[PDB]
């Protein structure tokens, strides 16, 4: 199977809930990463859907596929997709999933943490 999806909670700052669709076999190529990421409780909204891809072959180009008016959400989805695409040299689709209870100021306060934890997870899961 050339792709797989995994469900992960990232713990120990808000706990994050992740669904990631990933190439099963990986160097840097054609199969996109899709990431759904949000806070976890214990229904959610798809707040933003962002796409990025390396322009050449670093230049990665990106665009909102489903935009949000909230800069705090947009920033996160943009950074996530763009940094993932750069990091792994492949296209990336990112969804930011918002708990009914979400205060997006949490994304601002934990911005760098959220990005690095997702990169870390993806590193491991791509090996």
């Amino acid at each position: 199977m050339l792709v797989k999806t995994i469900s992960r909670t990232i713990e120990s700052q808000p706990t994050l809930d992740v669904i990631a669709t990933l190439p099963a076999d990986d160097r840097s190529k054609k199969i996109p990463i899709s990431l759904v990421v949000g806070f976890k409780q214990e229904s959610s909204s798809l707040s933003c859907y962002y796409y990025a891809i390396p322009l050449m072959r670093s230049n990665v180009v990106g665009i909102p596929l489903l935009d949000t008016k909230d800069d705090r959400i947009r920033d996160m989805a943009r950074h996530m997709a763009t940094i993932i695409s750069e990091r792994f040299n492949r296209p990336c689709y990112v969804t930011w999933s918002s708990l009914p209870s979400e205060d997006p100021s949490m994304l601002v306060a934990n911005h760098l943490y959220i990005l690095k934890k997702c990169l870390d997870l993806l590193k491991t899961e791509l090996g």
Binding site: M1, L2, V3, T5, S7, D17, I19, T21, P23, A24, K30, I31, P32, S34, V36, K40, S43, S44, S45, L46, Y49, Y51, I63, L65, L66, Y93, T95, S97, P100
Partner: protein, 132 residues
Amino acid sequence: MISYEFQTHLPKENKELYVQATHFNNTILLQIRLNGEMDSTYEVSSKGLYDDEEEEFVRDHLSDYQVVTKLGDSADPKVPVVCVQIAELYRRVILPEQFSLLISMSSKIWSADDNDFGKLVFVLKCIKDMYA
């Protein structure tokens, strides 16, 4: 939190077809990948809302959608057909076993046509077999 998925091969060297869906309060996000590839995205949303009972049958079964191309070809005649059929499957069948659907898919699954009804029916079956 809840992911749905289904992995098979296009009928009958068989290419891998992978479907996955995440459901949200506003939308469902559906992936349809061909050999892991995915290059287009579309937003499918519903257009608003003696004598005879047929005119209410007509209105109650008039199901039109707006298909917006977010990524990929915005002038493929086969896309709004596929998208509406997927949308209708979700509305009438899958939910249960408001309407917005975001579909990311490989354009390479689809008088230019190849074997389009059989291929459409198979993909619809895959989505249903997921429990979409």
